[PDB]
């Protein structure tokens, strides 16, 4: 039995970055050669050469799938900081895995604006590696409680993406699959 990697990459829908989808690959043969024969826009391996992975076995392999902007792809790399790295998808400095990204402007964009992809803008504290919260509780910036009401000095913690087909390269949607290696090639 071969690992269902195509069901991760060629899926019709990806999760939002504030609530990224952690897909577990297990008890299967992992063929990574397909991912090394693309024209994809980025392919970044940290500690795990793409020509070595086919000879390795792992306890588990995790594929985190989500949609972000092109300008935010650089925040996925380990040791980086920013609005995604700190409040949405934090990847550890000691990261072993590959980051695969491609432009999905033709799939994940709409003329009216695709608002089905949300990211977290505000938080009380920055995230730890591979942790995520899906809380929608009102974010308090001020010195007084608003009791859940988005009034003065209170904000809705989530912001939407508004992906559109005519955005620039760095603002067009990218489908990012992060392969974390904890399944034999």
């Amino acid at each position, epitope marked *: 039995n071969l690992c*269902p990697f195509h069901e991760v990459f060629n899926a*019709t829908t990806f999760a939002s970055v504030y609530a990224w989808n952690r897909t577990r690959i297990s008890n299967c043969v992992a063929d990574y050669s397909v991912l090394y024969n693309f024209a994809f826009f980025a392919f970044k391996c940290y500690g795990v050469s793409p020509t070595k992975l086919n000879d390795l076995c792992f306890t588990n392999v995790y594929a985190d799938s989500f949609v972000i902007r092109g300008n935010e792809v650089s925040q996925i790399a380990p040791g980086q900081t920013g609005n995604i790295a700190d409040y949405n998808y934090k990847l550890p400095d000691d990261f072993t895995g590959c980051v695969i990204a491609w432009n999905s402007n033709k799939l994940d964009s709409k003329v009216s604006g695709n608002y089905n992809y949300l990211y977290r803008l505000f938080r009380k504290s920055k995230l730890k590696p591979f942790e995520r919260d899906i809380s929608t509780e009102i974010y308090q910036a001020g010195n007084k409680p608003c009791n859940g009401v988005a009034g003065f000095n209170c904000y809705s913690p989530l912001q939407s993406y508004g992906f559109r087909p005519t955005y620039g390269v760095g603002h067009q949607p990218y489908r990012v699959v992060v392969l974390s290696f904890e399944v034999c090639g």
Partner: antibody
Amino acid sequence: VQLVQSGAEVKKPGASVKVSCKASGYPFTSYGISWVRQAPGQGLEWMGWISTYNGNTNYAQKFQGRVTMTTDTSTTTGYMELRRLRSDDTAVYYCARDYTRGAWFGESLIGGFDNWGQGTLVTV
Amino acid sequence: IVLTQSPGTLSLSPGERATLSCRASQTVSSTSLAWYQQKPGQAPRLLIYGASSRATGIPDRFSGSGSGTDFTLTISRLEPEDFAVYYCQQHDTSLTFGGGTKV
């Protein structure tokens, strides 16, 4: 990739017909099998879908209760059966290898029905 | 979701451009639509998937695109071998096919 279906059969009303589909040229358990019917002079009508990995199925609302599907991994062959045949069920029954739904996770894929069999004619 | 195709009979001379349309009663994703070609006496084959992505083995004569409820299939130059019946699909809800058109 090729799909080889059985030859034509003639059935009386109330009888059942089971149509085989032998698949080769690819990993059997990596792709699902779909079935599509085409009555004479008509277009394509979907009957159902089955996974070759976990046996999960998905049937069209116009066939539910009549159509059942199974697979045999050891012979890399799919099977479909339509019971309680009506005079309106005369058609060519097609087997196809889909890329529309994942065989393992059951999620929708970006694709279509890539490989088709020659079609099995059932008269009733 | 209901798929309707038009025109029913796109009978055009060889060498000319040929276009077909498919409309949906409900919106579908560009992720979920495909076009098929059926020659007389033969099973249909996949031409385009994902609205615009060309299937393996298919000539560059075939191109297409679409979103929402409006999708199209274009043949840049009609060949003698392109005189077949074409179908549009969707798998956003259950799985269905359009009525089909003859070129």
